Amino acid sequence: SFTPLVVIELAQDVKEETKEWLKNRIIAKKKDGGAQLLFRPLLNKYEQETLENQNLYLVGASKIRMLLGAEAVGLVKECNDNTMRAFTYRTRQNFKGFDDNNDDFLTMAECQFIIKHELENLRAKDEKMIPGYPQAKLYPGKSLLRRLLTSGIVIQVFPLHDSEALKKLEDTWYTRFALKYQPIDSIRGYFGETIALYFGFLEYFTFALIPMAVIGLPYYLFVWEDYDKYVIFASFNLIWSTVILELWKRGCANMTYRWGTLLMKRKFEEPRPGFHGVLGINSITGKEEPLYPSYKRQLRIYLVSLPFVCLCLYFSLYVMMIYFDMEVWALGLHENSGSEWTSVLLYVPSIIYAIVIEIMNRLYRYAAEFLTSWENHRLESAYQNHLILKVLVFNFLNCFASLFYIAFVLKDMKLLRQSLATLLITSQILNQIMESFLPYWLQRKHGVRVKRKVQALKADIDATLYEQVILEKEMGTYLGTFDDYLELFLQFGYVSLFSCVYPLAAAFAVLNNFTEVNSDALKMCRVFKRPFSEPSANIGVWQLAFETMSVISVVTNCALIGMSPQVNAVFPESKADLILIVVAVEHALLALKFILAFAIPDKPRHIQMKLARLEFESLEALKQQQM
Amino acid sequence: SFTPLVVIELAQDVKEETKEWLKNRIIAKKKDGGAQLLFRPLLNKYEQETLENQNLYLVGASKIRMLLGAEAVGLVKECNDNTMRAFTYRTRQNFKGFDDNNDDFLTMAECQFIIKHELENLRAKDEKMIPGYPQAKLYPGKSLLRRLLTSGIVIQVFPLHDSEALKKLEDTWYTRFALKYQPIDSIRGYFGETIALYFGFLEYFTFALIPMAVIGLPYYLFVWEDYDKYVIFASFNLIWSTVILELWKRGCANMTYRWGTLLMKRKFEEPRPGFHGVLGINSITGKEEPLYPSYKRQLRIYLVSLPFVCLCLYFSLYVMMIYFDMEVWALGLHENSGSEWTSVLLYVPSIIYAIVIEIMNRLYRYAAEFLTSWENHRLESAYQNHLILKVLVFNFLNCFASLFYIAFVLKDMKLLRQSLATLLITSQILNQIMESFLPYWLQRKHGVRVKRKVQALKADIDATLYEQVILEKEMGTYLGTFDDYLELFLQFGYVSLFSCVYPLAAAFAVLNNFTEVNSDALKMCRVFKRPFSEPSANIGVWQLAFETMSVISVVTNCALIGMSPQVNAVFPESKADLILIVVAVEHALLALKFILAFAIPDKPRHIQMKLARLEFESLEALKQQQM
Ligand SMILES: [Ca+2]
Ligand SMILES: [Ca+2]
Ligand SMILES: [Ca+2]
Ligand SMILES: [Ca+2]
Ligand SMILES: [Ca+2]
Ligand SMILES: [Ca+2]
């Protein structure tokens, strides 16, 4: 009669012996080699109509069980003396807002995180195989849930949405008529810390292009390129990108200390789901793990994947060259035909090119995910770095090659303004359609169909739970916060790479992000399943990617300074000093940008003092056991 | 009747109450608030001749005391299963080469380190002042030895040389007739880990300019600038500096794991000796510490020190301009006088300029050390960073301004070759005279005088100890490994900044370092006192300084490519494409250099596995106390 927290969906053709063996490994206590979780079927009775939903099981636990699981995970809660310490069951009375009759201490995100973590740490010791299935090779030290997922018995494990606390989050989230700081702490308590860091980063990055847009809106309209001759605005833009990328690191440390995930120790990562080698003794841990020879992994990268990426980049350049012949053909068609179709025909080939870019990027994303899931990467952190490298290089190249080809080969700034504005707005509109609005529309149709099916059932089913579980079974799963950072990287690419010749593009990012804060929120609320809460202390490798964009943008902006007609009027006869002065401005901005990233400290002032006290308190505890 | 390890030299005018109070705080046990160290006077009897040496005291301890002190410091020794773990007294039987009757377990360097560490951790609890001295303000939590040093009662605390194990180190150290790998492990066991890391770094850096010298010796003699036109050699030199600065980091982690100081935790640093503020509650530790308002420290830097450094840099440029008028005057005097004094007069003004540089650098070093000891820096790590910044900027500027002024203003490569070779060799010769050879000569005279005084004494003094302690009392103290890294930085500066126009200078570094390995060894053996052993895991901020030299050298070498007569023959008419191609080579080398520093991992492969096992073993221990 408990509250369901995690849903396990078994497959159809599952024998009874495996069901009872799994049920006996869940309910049995922690000292008997079980997991001590409360288990329940979805329905106590069944009729011939609902027999195809007879495999859904709910997993929860009791309060003392969640506290013992909180000791095992290492949740970081606030103490009564305003200090973030690791949670232990023996010292549980010290923490703020805690009673022994308080079910509101551990939030639903941490409770769902602990139950997924206890199913992950469910290992086999005596059993060499799963009873009833030959191919389930079980060695001692292998997770049970991982082998059930890879062998196709457990289809999906997903946490449950809370339909009455989600609406109270949505009431204070969708900003639409008034500027308002987004409630990142309530987002955190509902969605974990990784999803909250992205929404904190999106809310931060929106309030960092407002100086670019406010300065750059009259800088393009009133043409102030006569007075400063492009030196103040280019210098202001590039120094400003470094300042927001350093103040984001300060703000991210401050936020992630307020939640506690700055102090969680690095948990040792198990091999990822889909890493197969030969069974052997792991050298590091001393346990039994799959082993793979390192030379086969290095060969599969640097001889198959890297040539395939190079072929795809060459193929991306080939599609770019096709587009420019289409542009010349359309310009000739504009010279041929008339007066009426003289402005609408000029916007058509960039739109066709924009749609082809956003189709080829998703096609390249599936091929690169497959080609990196084929290389048998061991950890999950390593797999993410290689996938990020392949997809980032191609998306950088495929989106900005055409703008680079216009600016530095044709050298035609009127065509560059038109093409940059059209590419940015069309890619964003097509992004907002394929990311959130069209999947939300398909979900409304699918939700209405399941609801109209459930109200016509003629059974005594408690509908308030079964309808909810059936709806969240067929939702789409969240594939990490990787695409949601990639959209911001390409927006930051379109704004900052060519902010000299077209600063107005900065405004076209801000008017997008005022929707994106809404649109992504809808994508997490009514589109996808609830993602499992995952602790993260920073955005990760994306800090290096955004900073690399701000260094590349120095070279690109300085190359656009040395081609404008304003600066070439300064040195009409001596074109050998213009390049030297532009290179001096380029090296001075690069040196000043790296000094700014090196001068500003990474952690803030008072957070560094609180982290220093927590280290000194832990060092004295070791000293006290010695003393 | 023990073995003396540490000598404490008191002042002359020290009252008897302070002597007995200090002696009662040393001999008393660790539980009674003392230090439990064996204490002894230098001489049991005294005559009227040796009354001025009546304040020297010897401090040692017993074997169980050193093991308990080794638990407090955290020495990292090897276990029997080839694993580096922290030393504890309860698990003392696990470690290699250990008996209960083995005095060769803790080496003399670690024993002298523990005794200095126990005198440092000798705090006052009840006493508000030193008995007999008014000005010794004692608060609870203040070190006793630090206040005795600053108030001028304890003159110096220095460890003792072992005159029979030092000779057995010198027998295998001075290489002179045959190339030989320097014995860094025996250097480590005698001199601590910081001094051993410098000698390991000098031995490494010598075997890294041998490819520069071997390639650059026929590259200058046979003039191969015709065939490659300066592209291969400049690219080879700059990529090679990054490779040795990354393989040094790999080699330093490997060496410092073999000694154990990669795993010693960061000890919390006490305020440095000479930091005075107002007495208050330290916010971090919660103890009582001096506090200083942060705005006064920031004002004393950015309004007094930084203008003084700027005045000294302007004054350094003024001395440089005086030298060039002297060069033109000497060139005119060469045009005036004759044929005979036509080559010796050309080498005189650079030698006069070289002597003035090495005098002004030491004068600037005293002024900058004083000006940074005046800013009241709190920790010692922070004080070292500011002193390194002032001295490095001026030594970089004062040594290479003249070479920059010749290369990029006069643009005269014949004068540049002559001036660079003369500056490098004369600064090194004057460095080797003032660093080690002349202080060794003064020490031989001083040692003979004390020995001839001691053999004519007419007393029953045990001369084998008293002669040794009197000699090491008046030696010079080692002022950190800061000057010894600065010499290598300027050598690396003279080689790599202008390796294009003069690669022969690389050979002039190697023929210096083959002496420097000898010369510095003599400086540590027969010149200075024995330094106290100090643990260090890396060279510190010098990795950033050497890498910054290798990035600056890309820009300087590319600017020397774009001025030679070989490359200007490629583009005779179009001087606007030469700058673009040189800038493209400059940006391609900078991008490839940072990718090389980012691609090669910092820790080696197997050391990373051993450090990962040590983390997993410690994490399981926390898990076992929970389980
Ligand atoms: Ca979007
Ligand atoms: Ca998004
Ligand atoms: Ca920073
Ligand atoms: Ca020297
Ligand atoms: Ca030296
Ligand atoms: Ca590296």
Side-chain angles (χ1 to χ4, degrees), chain A residues 1-12 14-16 18-47 50-70 72-119 121-124 126-127 129-136 138-166 168-175 177-178 181-228 230-264 268 270-288 290-334 336-338 340-410 412-452 454-457 459 461 463-572 574-624, chain B residues 1-12 14-16 18-47 50-70 72-119 121-124 126-127 129-136 138-166 168-175 177-178 181-228 230-264 268 270-288 290-334 336-338 340-410 412-452 454-457 459 461 463-572 574-624:
Chain A
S1 67
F2 64 97
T3 46
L5 299 186
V6 158
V7 184
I8 299 179
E9 184 193 5
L10 295 199
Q12 292 289 333
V14 166
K15 312 173 209 189
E16 286 309 302
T18 318
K19 281 184 181 181
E20 309 303 339
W21 170 80
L22 180 66
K23 195 183 187 163
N24 269 325
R25 280 307 291 273
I26 281 179
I27 306 173
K29 314 174 80 72
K30 206 65 173 299
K31 56 196 76 175
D32 314 332
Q36 213 180 317
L37 301 165
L38 308 175
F39 192 88
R40 195 155 61 89
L42 189 53
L43 289 167
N44 333 2
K45 196 180 165 162
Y46 274 89
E47 71 201 358
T50 78
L51 283 198
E52 28 163 298
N53 299 353
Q54 78 185 321
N55 44 0
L56 290 165
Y57 293 134
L58 312 177
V59 172
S62 42
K63 290 175 55 178
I64 313 286
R65 189 55 197 92
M66 302 313 291
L67 294 182
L68 291 175
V73 162
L75 295 183
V76 178
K77 311 283 293 183
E78 62 287 353
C79 175
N80 265 346
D81 60 2
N82 276 262
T83 308
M84 313 294 295
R85 297 264 326 274
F87 184 75
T88 43
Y89 191 73
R90 298 308 185 88
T91 78
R92 68 181 207 262
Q93 291 276 357
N94 292 21
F95 299 110
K96 190 180 302 177
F98 180 75
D99 299 355
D100 285 302
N101 296 265
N102 190 12
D103 52 2
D104 316 315
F105 183 50
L106 291 192
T107 60
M108 212 192 190
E110 284 153 333
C111 295
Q112 280 147 356
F113 177 48
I114 286 158
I115 289 187
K116 182 55 191 304
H117 182 88
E118 292 305 328
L119 286 178
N121 283 46
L122 194 58
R123 314 177 178 272
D126 304 337
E127 302 114 333
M129 75 172 44
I130 284 181
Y133 276 70
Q135 290 175 338
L138 274 189
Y139 55 95
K142 168 187 235 168
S143 157
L144 284 190
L145 197 71
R146 207 77 64 86
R147 209 53 164 85
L148 282 163
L149 273 161
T150 316
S151 88
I153 307 184
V154 167
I155 297 183
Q156 54 197 338
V157 169
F158 60 96
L160 269 192
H161 267 289
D162 187 8
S163 65
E164 303 151 330
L166 183 53
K168 310 188 190 326
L169 170 66
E170 270 190 41
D171 291 348
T172 80
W173 204 354
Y174 296 148
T175 78
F177 310 104
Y181 293 98
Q182 213 170 177
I184 316 167
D185 268 325
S186 59
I187 290 162
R188 177 245 169 187
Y190 193 73
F191 281 118
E193 281 94 9
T194 301
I195 318 292
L197 215 63
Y198 163 66
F199 275 108
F201 180 70
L202 175 60
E203 183 204 331
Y204 180 76
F205 195 67
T206 307
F207 295 155
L209 296 183
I210 289 175
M212 285 290 312
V214 165
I215 295 301
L217 185 53
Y219 196 74
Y220 170 66
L221 290 180
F222 290 163
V223 59
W224 290 351
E225 328 175 359
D226 300 331
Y227 306 146
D228 78 310
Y230 278 142
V231 177
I232 288 178
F233 184 57
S235 142
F236 170 69
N237 154 255
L238 301 165
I239 294 181
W240 184 245
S241 68
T242 319
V243 159
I244 63 168
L245 283 178
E246 268 281 341
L247 296 191
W248 163 250
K249 281 197 297 179
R250 289 171 68 93
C252 163
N254 181 32
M255 274 198 300
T256 47
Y257 178 78
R258 213 168 76 236
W259 303 330
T261 67
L262 191 62
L263 302 154
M264 275 188 48
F268 185 83
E270 287 196 25
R272 68 171 301 260
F275 167 64
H276 51 74
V278 194
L279 270 183
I281 290 306
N282 202 11
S283 271
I284 300 164
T285 43
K287 315 183 142 188
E288 274 213 2
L291 298 199
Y292 205 77
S294 198
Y295 60 89
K296 292 187 172 186
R297 172 150 67 242
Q298 293 299 319
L299 279 193
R300 280 172 136 177
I301 295 178
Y302 288 153
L303 273 196
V304 178
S305 340
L306 174 63
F308 184 77
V309 174
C310 283
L311 163 75
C312 278
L313 297 195
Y314 167 71
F315 186 69
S316 178
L317 296 196
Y318 181 66
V319 179
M320 179 191 79
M321 295 312 292
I322 289 175
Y323 157 70
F324 276 102
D325 292 348
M326 180 152 298
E327 180 88 27
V328 170
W329 168 90
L331 193 64
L333 214 55
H334 155 268
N336 189 12
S337 231
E340 281 233 318
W341 289 68
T342 264
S343 83
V344 175
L345 196 53
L346 272 188
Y347 301 148
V348 169
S350 75
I351 285 169
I352 298 180
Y353 186 45
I355 296 179
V356 165
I357 278 175
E358 215 52 46
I359 278 180
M360 204 169 63
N361 285 2
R362 297 190 195 265
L363 294 193
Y364 183 84
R365 171 69 188 276
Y366 289 163
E369 164 179 359
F370 162 70
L371 210 64
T372 315
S373 156
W374 178 76
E375 301 160 10
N376 260 22
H377 278 297
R378 196 182 179 273
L379 314 163
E380 189 72 22
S381 88
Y383 163 73
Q384 282 296 323
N385 288 7
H386 285 281
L387 185 63
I388 283 165
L389 181 60
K390 290 177 179 61
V391 173
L392 203 66
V393 161
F394 180 76
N395 279 268
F396 183 87
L397 195 90
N398 200 23
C399 290
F400 308 119
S402 88
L403 307 175
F404 280 156
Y405 188 83
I406 288 171
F408 303 129
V409 170
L410 301 196
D412 186 25
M413 296 313 179
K414 41 167 193 157
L415 181 58
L416 180 56
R417 288 182 220 263
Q418 281 187 4
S419 180
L420 170 60
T422 46
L423 276 193
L424 178 57
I425 296 179
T426 306
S427 176
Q428 276 175 356
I429 278 177
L430 208 77
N431 198 257
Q432 291 282 80
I433 280 178
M434 299 324 272
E435 164 179 37
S436 86
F437 286 151
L438 167 69
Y440 172 64
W441 182 69
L442 276 169
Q443 190 56 47
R444 262 192 85 92
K445 262 180 183 181
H446 197 76
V448 160
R449 195 158 44 168
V450 160
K451 228 169 175 177
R452 203 188 40 86
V454 162
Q455 201 185 348
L457 193 63
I461 281 172
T464 156
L465 182 61
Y466 172 77
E467 168 179 335
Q468 169 179 0
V469 171
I470 288 301
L471 275 186
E472 295 189 46
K473 174 177 64 69
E474 293 143 18
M475 278 182 174
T477 193
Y478 194 68
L479 281 151
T481 55
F482 168 61
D483 310 276
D484 295 311
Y485 279 132
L486 181 58
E487 170 177 350
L488 291 181
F489 178 78
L490 297 186
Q491 265 184 53
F492 194 49
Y494 281 123
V495 163
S496 109
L497 281 173
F498 320 102
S499 60
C500 281
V501 308
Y502 197 62
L504 177 61
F508 292 155
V510 177
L511 287 178
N512 184 267
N513 284 351
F514 284 159
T515 80
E516 193 77 26
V517 166
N518 302 3
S519 156
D520 282 342
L522 169 67
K523 194 181 58 187
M524 303 310 293
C525 278
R526 300 296 162 180
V527 180
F528 282 146
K529 289 175 206 163
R530 185 169 184 164
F532 268 126
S533 161
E534 277 167 20
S536 102
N538 50 4
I539 53 174
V541 76
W542 286 109
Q543 193 79 29
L544 181 66
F546 275 98
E547 171 74 352
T548 306
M549 175 61 72
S550 157
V551 161
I552 288 172
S553 60
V554 165
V555 185
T556 303
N557 271 352
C558 286
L560 285 173
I561 286 165
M563 288 184 183
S564 45
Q566 323 270 137
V567 186
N568 280 268
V570 175
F571 320 98
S574 70
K575 306 300 191 190
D577 294 3
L578 158 73
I579 306 176
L580 275 179
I581 284 177
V582 162
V583 160
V585 163
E586 179 256 332
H587 282 137
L589 275 175
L590 280 186
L592 177 56
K593 166 180 299 283
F594 284 160
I595 279 167
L596 261 178
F598 186 73
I600 310 174
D602 305 4
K603 304 172 196 317
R605 192 56 171 179
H606 57 279
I607 309 297
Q608 196 164 1
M609 294 203 185
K610 282 157 182 184
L611 176 54
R613 184 180 309 139
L614 207 60
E615 269 273 350
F616 176 71
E617 212 175 36
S618 56
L619 174 66
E620 291 310 309
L622 287 195
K623 194 163 179 181
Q624 202 62 76
Chain B
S1 67
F2 64 97
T3 46
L5 299 185
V6 158
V7 184
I8 298 179
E9 184 193 5
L10 295 199
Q12 292 289 333
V14 166
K15 312 173 209 189
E16 286 309 302
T18 318
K19 281 184 181 181
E20 309 303 339
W21 170 80
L22 180 66
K23 195 183 187 163
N24 269 325
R25 280 307 291 273
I26 281 179
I27 306 173
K29 314 174 80 72
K30 206 65 173 299
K31 56 196 76 175
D32 314 332
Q36 213 180 317
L37 301 165
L38 308 175
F39 192 88
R40 195 155 61 89
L42 189 53
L43 289 167
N44 333 2
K45 196 181 165 162
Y46 274 89
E47 71 201 358
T50 78
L51 283 198
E52 28 163 298
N53 299 353
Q54 78 185 321
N55 44 0
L56 290 165
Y57 293 134
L58 312 177
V59 172
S62 42
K63 290 175 55 178
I64 313 286
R65 189 55 197 92
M66 302 313 291
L67 294 182
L68 291 175
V73 162
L75 295 183
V76 178
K77 312 283 293 183
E78 62 287 353
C79 175
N80 265 346
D81 60 2
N82 276 262
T83 308
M84 313 294 295
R85 297 264 326 274
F87 184 75
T88 43
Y89 191 73
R90 298 308 185 88
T91 78
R92 68 182 207 262
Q93 291 276 358
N94 292 21
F95 299 110
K96 190 180 302 178
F98 180 75
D99 299 355
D100 285 302
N101 296 265
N102 189 12
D103 52 2
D104 316 315
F105 183 50
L106 291 192
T107 60
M108 212 192 190
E110 284 153 333
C111 295
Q112 280 147 356
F113 177 48
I114 285 158
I115 289 187
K116 182 55 191 304
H117 183 88
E118 292 305 329
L119 286 178
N121 283 46
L122 194 58
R123 314 177 178 272
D126 304 337
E127 302 114 333
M129 75 172 44
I130 284 181
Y133 276 70
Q135 290 175 338
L138 274 189
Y139 55 95
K142 168 187 235 168
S143 157
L144 284 190
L145 197 71
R146 207 77 64 86
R147 209 53 164 85
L148 282 163
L149 273 161
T150 316
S151 88
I153 307 184
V154 167
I155 297 183
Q156 54 197 338
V157 169
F158 60 96
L160 269 192
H161 267 289
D162 187 8
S163 65
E164 303 151 330
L166 183 53
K168 310 188 190 325
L169 170 66
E170 270 190 41
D171 291 348
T172 80
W173 204 354
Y174 296 148
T175 78
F177 310 104
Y181 293 98
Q182 213 170 177
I184 316 167
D185 268 325
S186 59
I187 290 162
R188 177 245 169 187
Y190 193 73
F191 281 118
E193 281 94 9
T194 301
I195 318 292
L197 215 63
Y198 162 66
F199 275 108
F201 180 70
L202 175 60
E203 183 204 331
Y204 180 76
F205 195 67
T206 307
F207 295 155
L209 296 183
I210 289 175
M212 285 290 312
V214 165
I215 295 301
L217 185 53
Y219 196 74
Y220 170 67
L221 290 180
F222 290 163
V223 59
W224 290 351
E225 328 175 359
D226 300 330
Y227 306 146
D228 78 311
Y230 278 142
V231 177
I232 288 178
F233 183 57
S235 142
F236 170 69
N237 154 255
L238 301 165
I239 294 181
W240 184 245
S241 68
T242 319
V243 159
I244 63 168
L245 283 178
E246 268 281 341
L247 296 191
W248 163 250
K249 281 197 296 179
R250 289 170 68 93
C252 163
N254 181 32
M255 274 198 300
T256 47
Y257 178 78
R258 212 168 76 236
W259 302 330
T261 67
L262 191 62
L263 302 154
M264 275 188 48
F268 185 83
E270 287 196 25
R272 68 171 301 260
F275 167 64
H276 51 74
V278 194
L279 270 183
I281 290 306
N282 202 11
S283 271
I284 300 164
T285 43
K287 315 183 142 188
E288 274 213 2
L291 298 199
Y292 205 77
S294 198
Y295 60 89
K296 292 187 172 186
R297 172 150 67 242
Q298 293 299 319
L299 279 193
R300 280 172 136 177
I301 295 178
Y302 288 153
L303 273 196
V304 178
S305 340
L306 173 63
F308 184 77
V309 174
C310 283
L311 163 75
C312 278
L313 297 195
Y314 167 71
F315 186 69
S316 178
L317 296 196
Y318 182 66
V319 179
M320 179 191 79
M321 295 312 291
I322 289 175
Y323 157 70
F324 276 102
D325 292 348
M326 180 152 298
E327 180 88 27
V328 170
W329 168 90
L331 193 64
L333 214 55
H334 155 268
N336 189 12
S337 231
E340 281 233 318
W341 289 68
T342 264
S343 83
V344 175
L345 196 53
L346 272 188
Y347 301 148
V348 169
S350 75
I351 285 169
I352 298 180
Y353 186 45
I355 296 179
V356 165
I357 278 175
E358 215 52 46
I359 278 180
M360 204 169 63
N361 285 3
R362 297 190 195 265
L363 294 193
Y364 183 84
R365 171 69 188 275
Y366 290 163
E369 164 179 359
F370 162 70
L371 210 64
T372 315
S373 156
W374 178 76
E375 301 160 10
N376 260 22
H377 278 297
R378 196 182 179 273
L379 314 163
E380 189 72 22
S381 88
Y383 163 73
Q384 282 296 323
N385 287 6
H386 285 281
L387 185 63
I388 284 165
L389 181 60
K390 290 177 179 61
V391 173
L392 203 66
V393 161
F394 180 76
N395 279 268
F396 183 87
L397 195 90
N398 200 23
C399 290
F400 308 119
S402 88
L403 307 175
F404 280 156
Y405 188 83
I406 288 171
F408 303 129
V409 169
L410 302 196
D412 186 25
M413 296 313 179
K414 41 167 193 157
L415 181 58
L416 180 55
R417 288 182 220 263
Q418 281 187 3
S419 180
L420 170 60
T422 46
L423 276 193
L424 178 57
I425 296 179
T426 306
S427 176
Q428 276 175 356
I429 278 177
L430 208 77
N431 198 257
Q432 291 282 80
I433 280 178
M434 299 324 272
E435 164 179 37
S436 86
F437 286 151
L438 167 69
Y440 172 64
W441 182 69
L442 276 169
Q443 190 56 46
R444 262 192 85 92
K445 262 180 183 181
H446 197 76
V448 160
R449 195 158 44 168
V450 160
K451 228 169 175 177
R452 203 188 40 86
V454 162
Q455 201 185 348
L457 193 63
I461 281 172
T464 157
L465 182 61
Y466 172 77
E467 168 179 335
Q468 169 179 0
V469 171
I470 288 301
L471 275 186
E472 295 189 46
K473 174 177 64 69
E474 293 143 18
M475 278 182 174
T477 193
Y478 194 68
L479 281 151
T481 55
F482 168 61
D483 310 276
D484 295 311
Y485 279 132
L486 181 58
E487 170 177 350
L488 292 181
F489 178 78
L490 297 186
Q491 265 184 52
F492 194 49
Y494 281 123
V495 163
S496 109
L497 281 173
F498 319 102
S499 60
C500 281
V501 308
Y502 197 62
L504 177 61
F508 292 155
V510 177
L511 286 178
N512 184 267
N513 284 351
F514 284 159
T515 80
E516 193 77 26
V517 165
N518 302 3
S519 156
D520 282 342
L522 169 67
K523 194 181 58 187
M524 303 310 293
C525 278
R526 300 296 162 180
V527 180
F528 282 146
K529 289 176 206 163
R530 185 169 184 164
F532 268 126
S533 161
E534 277 167 20
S536 102
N538 50 4
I539 53 174
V541 76
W542 286 109
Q543 193 79 29
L544 181 66
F546 274 98
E547 171 74 352
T548 306
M549 175 61 72
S550 157
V551 161
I552 288 172
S553 60
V554 165
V555 185
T556 303
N557 271 352
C558 286
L560 285 173
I561 286 165
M563 288 184 183
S564 45
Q566 323 270 137
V567 186
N568 280 268
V570 175
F571 320 98
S574 70
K575 306 300 191 190
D577 294 3
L578 158 74
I579 306 176
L580 275 179
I581 284 177
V582 162
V583 160
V585 163
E586 179 256 332
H587 282 137
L589 275 175
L590 280 186
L592 177 56
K593 166 180 299 283
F594 284 160
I595 279 167
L596 261 178
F598 186 73
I600 310 174
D602 305 4
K603 304 172 196 317
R605 192 56 171 179
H606 57 279
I607 309 297
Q608 196 164 1
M609 294 203 185
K610 282 156 182 184
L611 176 54
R613 183 180 309 139
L614 207 60
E615 269 273 350
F616 176 71
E617 212 175 37
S618 56
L619 174 66
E620 291 310 309
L622 287 195
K623 194 163 179 181
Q624 202 62 76

